[PDB]
Paper text:
5-Hydroxymethylcytosine is then released via hydrolysis of the N-glycosidic bond of hmCMP by MilB. To a less extent, MilB can also directly hydrolyze CMP to ribose 5′-phosphate and cytosine, which is further processed by downstream enzymes in the mildiomycin biosynthesis pathway and is incorporated into the dehydroxymethyl mildiomycin as a minor component of the fermentation products of S. remofaciens. Although MilB belongs to the nucleoside 2′-deoxyribosyltransferase (NDT) family, it catalyzes the hydrolysis of hmCMP and CMP rather than hmdCMP or dCMP. In this study, we determined the crystal structures of wild-type (WT) MilB by itself to a resolution of 1.8 Å and its catalytically inactive E103A point mutant in complex with its natural substrate hmCMP to a resolution of 2.4 Å.
Based on the previous structural study on NDT, which shows that the conserved glutamic acid is the active-site nucleophile, we constructed the E103A point mutant of MilB, which does not possess the hmCMP/CMP hydrolysis activity, and determined the crystal structure of MilB-E103A in complex with hmCMP. The MilB-E103A/hmCMP complex also crystallizes with one molecule per asymmetric unit. The final model at 2.4 Å resolution contains residues 12–170 of MilB-E103A in complex with one hmCMP molecule. When in complex with hmCMP, MilB has essentially the same structure as that by itself, with a root-mean-square deviation (RMSD) value of 0.223 Å. The hmCMP molecule is located in a deep surface pocket of MilB, surrounded by α-helices α1, α2, α3, α4 and α5. The benzene ring of Phe22 forms planar stacking interactions with the pyrimidine ring of hmCMP. In the electron density map of the MilB-E103A/hmCMP complex, the side chain of Arg23 can be placed in two alternative ways, suggesting that it varies between two different conformations, ‘intermediate’ and ‘closed’. In the ‘intermediate’ state, the side chain of Arg23 employs a half-bended-half-stretched conformation, with its guanidinium group 4.36 Å away from the oxygen atom of the hydroxymethyl group of hmCMP. On the other hand, in the ‘closed’ conformation, Arg23 is completely bended back toward the active site pocket of MilB, so as to recognize hmCMP. Its guanidinium group makes two hydrogen bonds with the hydroxymethyl group and the phosphate group of hmCMP, with distances of 2.73 and 2.37 Å, respectively.
Numbering used by the authors: 12 to 170
The structure:
Amino acid sequence: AVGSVFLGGPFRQLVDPRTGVMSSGDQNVFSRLIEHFESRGTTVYNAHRREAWGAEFLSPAEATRLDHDEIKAADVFVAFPGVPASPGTHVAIGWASGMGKPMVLLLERDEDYAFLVTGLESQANVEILRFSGTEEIVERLDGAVARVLGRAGEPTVIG
Ligand SMILES: Nc1nc(=O)n([C@@H]2O[C@H](COP(=O)(O)O)[C@@H](O)[C@H]2O)cc1CO
């Protein structure tokens, strides 16, 4: 049973400038993923919700520090690299892969992602899960987390 996950993904690009928040459709997937885990006993660290989906904006420095602490604390790292790419999320993949964290990465099926993203499959303790909608993710996530979590500590290139 999984104590803690860090859930990451695009943020800045999903904020509506007119409202200063993400739309319910974009919050959709995050909230769905949060519930799923929380209902099962698993603490979810997630910046989108912590920062009221754009309304309670941090300083770059605060935001940077919290994210790195939460990543380091969570048992498993789960994130959406984003199409187009989420700059802050890619920084976080660097952090997590650099700590040898169990990671699950959520990739839109039939979309292109970076070499240094896809190249972590095998190279680190990572599992890629391609998806055409949120329910697919919700169905497959627990298995993906258990498999990566069942390899924690184990040496890897990069780990
Ligand atoms: N205010 C923010 N707080 C944050 O914690 N972040 C972190 O950086 C990621 C989003 O990066 P972008 O905002 O660059 O897409 C999120 O997963 C979040 O963990 C990003 C922003 C906006 O750059």
